[PDB]
Design a protein around this ligand. Structure first.
Ligand code: SF4
Ligand code: SF4
Ligand code: F3S
Ligand code: F3S
Ligand SMILES: [C-]#N
Ligand SMILES: [C-]#N
Ligand SMILES: [C-]#N
Ligand SMILES: [C-]#N
Ligand SMILES: [Fe+2]
Ligand SMILES: [Fe+2]
Ligand SMILES: [Mg+2]
Ligand SMILES: [Mg+2]
Ligand code: 3NI
Ligand code: 3NI
Ligand SMILES: [O]
Ligand SMILES: [O]
Ligand SMILES: [O]
Ligand SMILES: [O]
Ligand SMILES: [O]
Ligand SMILES: [O]
Lengths: 273, 595, 595, 267
């Protein structure tokens, strides 16, 4: 029998669900038919309304302590939580109930990990990442898989790791799997030789742009951003933001929306600053 | 109560109330409540958007050049369309004209999104309202192959043994007792009308579409870095072109990347023509006696218009816009997103506050101040809604109107508008689709009488679904034309991709306002920006699902979702397949609707 | 002259002489000459390798650790097998044991090569000896679909419309008058025995195989950087493994890379079983009356043996080696590549010199000194060969013998050796393949009497062709086993990929010799190295096509190519379809043969 | 009509032909059916012997001045040229004859461009690259597309450029298209951050190897090698030598076999 997965959706844009189904290997079809049991997921699921709710009830008891709770999006705390209503009740109540009997949590994406766009100033809904919502006393692992969205093969790679090797992958201090989040973009960037030579895009579509010069001067946040974009890359290894000519915007990092303008130059560059 | 709406509906909430929360197989969060009469016919419908994030609020004070990335995150399904609206709105405000190749690449990205979004919507969100996978286990593989060859003769994937292998996989899945995404489906409801063989074909194609969809978005990865959420920028595209010069292999776009795009385009065209369009036609034929769900599409439709063959010349739009009102397809009313008497948003039945709530605000004047407040006739409590009170505020969706009219938006709106404006590609698609539909109907019913009434055929849930598929096909052909134009431009010496004349805010006027429009997958999208001293003073979005999913306005007009449900009989009100089928035909994007 | 060879042939060159130069649809360069009697039956056959580069010479003085990259470039078809032989030879000489994961990854690369090489050989090099693309244009697409469903019920790609679309594309190519690779083919020769429907099915599959083949080699790209010509190293594999640790995404092998490999493996298995194997069986049935070409295969076969389930333990070889001589399948003679009385190379009829040309040299004692010299009976001149003089030196290929015996090598040799040694997987494949063959024959002839004689079945050009396909299927299954073992090793804590104890030449003995063996796609491969003071003193290769394409030895024994043509009738000697069909069944690699 | 291409094969291993058919976009099937007319190619063609030779004769005359001559491998000058025999005659004579009436030549791979492995010391056959065999007087473009083999999409990218844009791509001073050969591996290498930090593989399967550290100290020749491996990459963008853990061996550069041991540092 296949590992039960409950995939909840809070305040979100659905990019993490979309990314997941882009996976080249394993295919999403095979993950759902043969690897896990995707027992609840508002995006793909047959049942609605009362029939959907019933599933939650049933899984929760049938598989108490044995389901993975995957969370996309996040709970709002403003508007008495009714800026995200599910079954007539705050999403936060759904999240808490299912968290209580989960084996482990996967915080998909920057929304569940950190807050993402709805949490940017002034955060009208008091959108709150999963780990902060559950607080310091929550006693099960929370695996943060950040990015807006994460890379597809990173998402399915986390799942296949757990299914193949029978353990939670090693996590850094922020809860991110070292499998994918233990280097900065700039630590494995093929444009680095240009950075080193002082060869930059100075203005869009300049000489440097057409040669693939470094994007630091046009705002690349790769120097401060931990992700697999420059190694695994995106959409079956096709590209990543920097390859296609736009700097990293920092989208896996806590607080990236408020770090500064995407076209502001990254900090912490000198070891004598 | 019995409410007689100005748009000619009688909303009657005395019958039995049915609540659907969550509405699944949409993006985001929705609640729908209906009332049915003693004959199980829907006599009231209530559309509730159950989420809000506040992007309009979050944008205030930020740099207009950054906005696209924030608003792109309105939605990961229609990923990129908000970025495109944004950059266009800023370029409008600042009088920025972009290079040809930037126009083309943006259009290529847009048509990629349309194809991806439409295909995934039909198979992965919609199909389970028409397809019963459990019944597919009853199919004969040889008869399934025979059906396949008739539905789509050119598709190679028809072997009886292939269908049998698919069937074995789904049987294994079911026999496991872990039914996952099929658990608790309404599979015994007689509202499901396909043969076992058609169910098996359709499930087969669901799987083929899940495998296919990840390929087409590689066009976004090439031009935009990634999918979801490709990159954009004000004044051009970031994907600089270098085909033949020093360091070309290191440029975003080089010969090899162009060859890859060509390949991807062709794969998408083939899937449109061989799998998606033929499936929608054939499933429509099985459902030939179920023509509910037309709603407003019969009377009031709108789109801003898109895809001009000549950049910046809207008379050349390949999906021309305007508004048809009161069902007169002979009168195309021009739509101007700048006119304060045209697009207006009301909040009398929404969870927002205005200083003067009698007003509809044009979006340059828009206000987004949350006001979560339940009416005094609510059953339940503030954090436990049992039956929402639709006489008061009942949604996070604002109420947009066009000159005070409620309209439907989306592919069907655009198809009606294009047909009515003499777009020959569209007319040919519609007529040949009708002809094909009637042929498949005659396969199924040898006494079938041909359907000839185009208003009846298009103005339905089936017609809405068909128009979406046809639009996908049209987008694939257009995108190939755009690619060929890009190649031609490069061949004639133009590899330029960005205009930086107005990159620096020192070049901007102190005060500026702009609007950017997009033919987004679900209909008419626009963003309205007000800039002051380099910063965003106001930023208002009105998105397709905002239109379609609208609650009532101060005069009591109902929006497209509510209208579409009125008068639909349900086999089993408590297993509301019909409701889902019709709502899903609009492809609701609830994160979009509320932003 | 009439020459009565010690291996029981009568080579008679008094009949009409037919020259084929170039022999196309091989790797590299070959010339073949035959003589036909008055009944157009071949009574003499002459194998000439028409290229030489001198890799053995070039390696002298170089570092053993570099050798694999040089010898890999012996051949880009069997790309990697020479690298593998090389590192094994150096590791043998220096007593280096590699980690289990290195053993496994090398086997996965080897099996990837087998599959790729076998599929491309059959479709892109061999098929046009059996398949008439012109006749495919006469096929009925519906009857083609019916044939396809019979040949391979599980393959999905069977629609009549698909076969019609392929036909349309070939018709357009023909109609263009630019016939390219099909130009002047022998398409009116009655040696072509397929129905038009089988020809169309097979052309369809040629195109499917051309699209597929580029996918499987992605396994080489992951473990070895690139294909053709993946990287290797002495003592391990360079593709270090890190699944879970710091910087895993930047390691050569991580979770995503493993998932990619799994996907690729399964795609290959599927193509083997659904496309390749069924095609060869079905084509064989259409050729059931054409059992020519056995040659040495049912008397004298050899392989070194490969793929031990327990590393470094040959009694566990999944393709066990040895030599069968004189047709006694009940006696497996052990083969020892170290024994100077076993493998020896003569040059009596080759373009090389030895001090004592009467000797056969074991490869640790081998000599490669070129001696291009034509016999005084040549028709033509040194730079214009009209008819080569096979009584003298007539090839760049040396003459390898095993204890003085001429033997055939290749997948057919391995299949006979494996069958004879009780390898149940192989026994099952042979028997099921014979049954399937006879089933198709009876579909073609209800009056068919089943073929039961395995020596006659397997010992033919058809059998040689079948054995190659079966081997591809077996390699896919074994490769999956290897993958699962690699995952198990990693799960139990072992991610190691290299042993560096002997990396530095200071750790080496001043004198050492070694031999590395491989079950290469075309048969028995070995490299013999002599090391002196850190440098290559001698490096000798004896490759599969060296054995098969061998010219005569001092006693007059003929090699496998020459034997295989003897006694074959030709419909049209000047349109030598039968010669091409049989030579191609050996998959000649002439760059390999001569190195 | 589709552009006529004659693909000759001298002394070679056939890796360039193999690479060509790996092309992800365009597919080889589509190149041959729809883009070019592959009129002669020993590897894939139906015809042999006299029937094959006859096509060369016919294409030469019929398309005189109008075919592209693609060459894989190279001509030997030793053994009177009979270390590579085609149709009983030296390959060099075939090459000369077809070069005389070509519109342009494509020198595929390091064999045709430079000499590759058979030309490494002591070059027993006097294997000679195409441009040197034809000499300074040769009056048509020779496009060198080096590498052992070249990347598949580079090969098909050169052909699609010429067909789409109606010109020879711009070449560097060595005759290589700037489209693909105008940066060194090291100038676009994703391991460069490690080079910059002094983070190297020091021994196979060390800590550095398992983190993807720079391969300079184990002999990477990327600092001196011009190719698209670190940008386009190999086999549908799957990998390249360095990604998979082995240094570049320099395989697109003239003389790479004789530049020293592959495991000795780039100096
Ligand atoms: S700043 Fe950005 S583009 Fe430049 S080297 Fe670093 S990550 Fe790459
Ligand atoms: S030496 Fe080689 S591995 Fe290191 S950065 Fe340069 S090219 Fe990359
Ligand atoms: S913007 Fe995000 S997708 Fe990767 S390159 Fe930067 S972390
Ligand atoms: S060895 Fe060759 S394949 Fe590329 S990485 Fe170096 S030029
Ligand atoms: C949104 N479409
Ligand atoms: C979007 N609606
Ligand atoms: C070679 N095999
Ligand atoms: C290889 N022979
Ligand atoms: Fe949207
Ligand atoms: Fe070989
Ligand atoms: Mg709004
Ligand atoms: Mg030898
Ligand atoms: Ni959306
Ligand atoms: Ni070979
Ligand atoms: O969206
Ligand atoms: O959307
Ligand atoms: O949305
Ligand atoms: O080879
Ligand atoms: O070979
Ligand atoms: O070879």
């Amino acid at each position: 029998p296949r590992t039960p997965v409950i995939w909840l959706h809070g305040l979100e844009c659905t990019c993490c669900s979309e990314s997941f189904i882009r996976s080249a290997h394993p295919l999403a079809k095979d993950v759902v038919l043969s690897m896990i049991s995707l027992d609840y997921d508002d995006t793909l699921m047959a049942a609605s309304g009362h029939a959907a709710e019933a599933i939650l009830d049933e899984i929760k008891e049938k598989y108490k302590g044995n389901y993975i709770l995957a969370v996309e999006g996040n709970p709002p705390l403003n508007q008495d939580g009714m800026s995200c209503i599910i079954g007539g009740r705050p999403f936060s109540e759904q999240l808490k109930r299912m968290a209580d009997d989960a084996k482990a949590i996967i915080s998909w994406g920057s929304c569940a990990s950190w807050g993402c766009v709805q949490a940017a100033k002034p955060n009208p809904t008091q959108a709150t990442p999963v780990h902060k919502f559950l607080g310091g006393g929550y006693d099960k692992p929370i695996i943060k898989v950040p990015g807006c969205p994460p890379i597809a093969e990173v998402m399915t790679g986390v799942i296949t790791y757990m299914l193949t090797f029978d353990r939670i992958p090693e996590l850094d201090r922020q809860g991110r799997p070292k499998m994918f989040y233990s280097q900065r973009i700039h630590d494995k960037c093929y444009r680095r030789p240009h950075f080193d030579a002082g060869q930059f895009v100075e203005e869009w579509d300049d000489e440097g742009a057409r040669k693939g010069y470094c994007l630091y001067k046009v705002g690349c946040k790769g120097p401060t951003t931990y992700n697999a974009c420059s190694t695994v890359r995106w959409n079956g290894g096709t590209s990543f933001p920097i390859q296609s000519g736009h700097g990293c915007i920092g989208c896996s990092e806590d607080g990236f929306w408020d770090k500064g303008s995407f076209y502001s130059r990254d900090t912490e560059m000198n070891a004598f600053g | 109560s019995v409410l007689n709406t100005p748009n000619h509906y009688k909303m009657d909430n005395s019958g039995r109330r049915v609540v659907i929360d969550p509405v699944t197989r949409i993006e985001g969060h929705m609640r729908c409540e209906v009332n049915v009469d003693e004959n199980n016919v829907i006599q009231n419908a209530v559309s509730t958007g159950t989420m809000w994030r506040g992007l309009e609020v979050i944008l205030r004070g930020r740099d207009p050049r950054d906005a696209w990335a924030f608003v792109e995150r309105i939605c990961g399904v229609c990923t990129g369309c908000h970025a495109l609206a944004s950059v266009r709105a800023v370029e409008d405000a600042l009088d920025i004209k972009i290079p040809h190749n930037a126009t083309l690449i943006r259009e290529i990205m847009a048509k990629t999104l349309q194809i991806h979004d439409h295909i995934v919507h039909f198979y992965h969100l919609h199909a389970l309202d028409w397809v019963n996978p459990v019944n597919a286990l009853k199919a004969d593989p040889q008869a399934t192959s025979e059906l396949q060859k008739l539905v789509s003769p050119h598709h190679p994937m028809s072997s009886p043994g292939y269908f049998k292998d698919i069937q074995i996989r789904i049987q294994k899945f079911v026999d496991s007792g872990q039914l996952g995404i099929f658990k608790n489906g309404y599979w015994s409801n007689p509202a499901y009308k396909l043969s076992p063989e058609a169910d098996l074909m359709a499930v087969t194609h669901y799987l083929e579409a899940l495998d296919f969809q990840k390929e087409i978005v590689k066009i976004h990865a090439i031009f935009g870095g990634k999918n979801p959420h490709p990159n954009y920028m004000v004044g051009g595209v970031p994907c600089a072109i270098n085909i033949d010069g020093d360091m070309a292999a290191g440029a975003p776009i080089n010969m090899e990347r162009l060859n890859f795009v060509k390949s991807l385009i062709e794969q998408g065209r083939t899937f449109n023509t061989n799998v998606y369009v033929p499936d929608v036609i054939a499933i429509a034929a099985f459902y030939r006696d179920w023509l509910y769900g037309g709603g407003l599409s019969a009377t009031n439709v709108m789109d801003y218009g898109a895809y001009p063959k000549t950049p910046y010349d809207k008379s050349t739009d390949q999906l021309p816009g305007g508004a048809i009102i009161n069902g007169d397809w002979g009168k195309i009313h021009p739509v101007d997103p700048r006119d304060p008497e045209q697009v207006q948003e009301f909040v009398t039945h929404s969870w927002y506050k205005y200083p003067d709530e009698t007003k509809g605000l044009h979006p340059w004047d828009g206000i987004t101040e949350p006001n979560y407040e339940l009416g005094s006739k609510t059953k339940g409590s503030r954090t436990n809604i049992i039956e929402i009170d639709e006489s008061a505020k009942y949604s996070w969706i604002k109420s947009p109107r066009w000159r005070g009219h409620a309209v439907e938006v989306g592919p069907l709106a655009r198809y009606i508008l294009a047909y009515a404006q003499g777009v020959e590609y569209v007319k040919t698609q519609v007529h040949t689709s009708l002809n094909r539909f009637n042929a498949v109907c005659r396969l199924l019913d040898p006494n079938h009488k041909d359907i000839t009434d185009l208003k009846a055929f298009l103005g339905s849930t089936i017609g809405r679904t068909l128009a979406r598929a046809l639009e996908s096909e049209y987008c694939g052909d257009m995108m190939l034309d755009d690619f060929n134009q890009l190649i031609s431009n490069i061949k004639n010496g133009d590899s330029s991709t960005a205009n930086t004349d107005k990159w620096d805010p020192s070049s901007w006027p102190e005060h500026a306002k702009g609007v950017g429009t997009v033919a987004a997958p679900r209909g008419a999208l626009a963003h309205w920006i007000v800039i002051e001293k380099g910063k965003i003073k106001n930023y208002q979005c009105v998105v397709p699902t905002t239109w379609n999913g609208s609650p009532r306005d101060p005069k009591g007009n109902i929006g497209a979702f509510e209208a579409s449900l009125m008068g639909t009989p349900m086999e089993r009100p408590d297993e509301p397949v019909e409701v889902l089928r019709t709502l899903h035909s609009f492809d609701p994007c609830l994160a979009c609707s509320t932003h």
